[PDB]
Design a protein around this nucleic acid. Structure first.
Ligand SMILES: COc1ccc([C@@]23Oc4cc(OC)cc(OC)c4[C@@]24NC(C)=N[C@@]4(O)[C@H](C(=O)N(C)OC)[C@H]3c2ccccc2)cc1
Ligand SMILES: Nc1ncnc2c1ncn2[C@@H]1O[C@H](COP(=O)(O)OP(=O)(O)NP(=O)(O)O)[C@@H](O)[C@H]1O
Ligand SMILES: [Mg+2]
Length: 378
RNA sequence: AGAGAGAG
């Protein structure tokens, strides 16, 4: 039930070569618990702290199950955003590099004719996608579910939310009745867990109490801003005060991302911005330029709150507080990846500091006032 | 009715 070495998981030699080439050495806590029941075919609900390696948990399990000589799609992974799907596809391709497993991204904002021409010719072993384009390709029969034996929902509690649950159900109805289902997330509320009883067969539950989700390496602070009209000057002050690797600044609406980005540019501050109403060509460039370090400060919506992994991010600023409790955990988790040291700063008006106290109580955490004029907080 | 989530 606990297997502390990749060497003891009965993985193929090519899969192990790919794991070690990517730079892993020992499995994370969640990997030691969840890879083997997934390989064995059990329905699994896998929860673990942000940044602990849930991607490779399902990636390694899918790869080990692939029948390489079967030229058909055998596994389908869904993610809530295009950026997250693209990121998962790269991890899966890297881990399976020595196996020649094929992994295809089925995501919106890409040219449909080009995808259709690829899928008319080849049946990728592994599909990583977003729900809209996946449902589209299933309806037009360019993706076949005939041999899909593994269905993975990353960020599963978001995928089973009001906005996505019906999309996931529509896709699920296309799949064979015997398909294995694997769910992963940092957050798994009891109401989402009840929805899983409707479609998962007596799953293995690896769950983490909410009071244990917060990372020790992510120091959480708040700043009394009192008035919303004062947030902009506070941000500008934090730009000049704080030591700057890379930072993500979260905003609750696309409209306000656009507003804030213009305000910062007018004041000669260098920032980039991304949200879901931008052309996908622009999203791809912005994401690429943040990954490379060309841009160090990104203003974004919850488009980038879940799953995105930029190791150099050490600072998250909640310029708007998240209304949703679960979202708070995902946001601050963009800093402090795989045990790195991070800071999260919450900007709080009078009306916000209630919402803040409820977050503190729910997660049994403590959020401290940010020191004055301290450049290096943690 | 936030954020995302095919297409045109
Ligand atoms: C027939 O093939 C499809 C494929 C995809 C889609 C959809 O994919 C979307 C993705 C989007 O990304 C920006 C936007 C978007 O609409 C503005 C849609 C949808 N297009 C339309 C017209 N309606 C949608 O909103 C669908 C939806 O959720 N509802 C409640 O309407 C049924 C949605 C969907 C349904 C099942 C499974 C996955 C996704 C509908 C029908
Ligand atoms: N065994 C491992 N050894 C070293 N690094 C690892 C290992 N497993 C995963 N990582 C790295 O850990 C980082 C976070 O992995 P990722 O899979 O994005 O985390 P996660 O659990 O899905 N986080 P989140 O989606 O926000 O809940 C990545 O940079 C991985 O490459
Ligand atoms: Mg993840």
């Amino acid at each position: 039930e606990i297997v502390d070495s990749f060497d003891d998981m009965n993985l193929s030699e090519s899969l192990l070569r790919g794991i070690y080439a990517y730079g892993f050495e020992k499995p994370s806590a969640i990997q030691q618990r969840a890879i083997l029941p997934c390989i064995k075919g059990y329905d699994v609900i896998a929860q673990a702290q942000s940044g602990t390696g849930k991607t490779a948990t399902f990636a390694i399990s899918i790869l080990q199950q692939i029948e390489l000589d079967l030229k058909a799609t055998q596994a389908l992974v869904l993610a809530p955003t295009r950026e997250l799907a693209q990121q998962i596809q790269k991890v899966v391709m890297a881990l399976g590099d020595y196996m020649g497993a094929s992994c295809h991204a089925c995501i919106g904002g890409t040219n449909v004719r080009a995808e259709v021409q690829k899928l008319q010719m080849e049946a990728p072993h592994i599909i990583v996608g977003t729900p809209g384009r996946v449902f589209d390709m299933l309806n037009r029969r360019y993706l076949s579910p005939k041999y899909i034996k593994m269905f993975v929902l990353d960020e599963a509690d978001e995928m089973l939310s009001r906005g996505f649950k019906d999309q996931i159900y529509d896709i699920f109805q296309k799949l064979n009745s015997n398909t294995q289902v694997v769910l992963l997330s940092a957050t798994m509320p009891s109401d989402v867990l009840e929805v899983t009883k409707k479609f998962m067969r007596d799953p293995i539950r690896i769950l983490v109490k909410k009071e244990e989700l917060t990372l020790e390496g992510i120091r959480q602070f708040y700043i009394n801003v009192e008035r919303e009209e004062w947030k902009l000057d506070t941000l500008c002050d934090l730009y000049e005060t704080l030591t700057i690797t890379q930072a993500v600044i979260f905003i609750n609406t696309r409209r306000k991302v656009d507003w804030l980005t213009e305000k910062m540019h007018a004041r000669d501050f260098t920032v980039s911005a991304m949200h879901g109403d931008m052309d996908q060509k622009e999203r791809d460039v912005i994401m690429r330029e943040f990954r490379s370090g060309s841009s160090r400060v990104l203003i974004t919506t919850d488009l980038l709150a879940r799953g995105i992994d930029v190791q150099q991010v050490s600072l998250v600023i909640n310029y708007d507080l998240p209304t949703n409790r679960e979202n708070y955990i995902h946001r601050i988790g963009r800093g402090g990846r795989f045990g790195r040291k991070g800071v999260a700063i919450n900007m709080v008006t009078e009306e916000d500091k209630r919402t803040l106290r409820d977050i503190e109580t729910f997660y049994n955490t403590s959020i401290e006032e940010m020191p004055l004029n301290v450049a290096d907080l943690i």
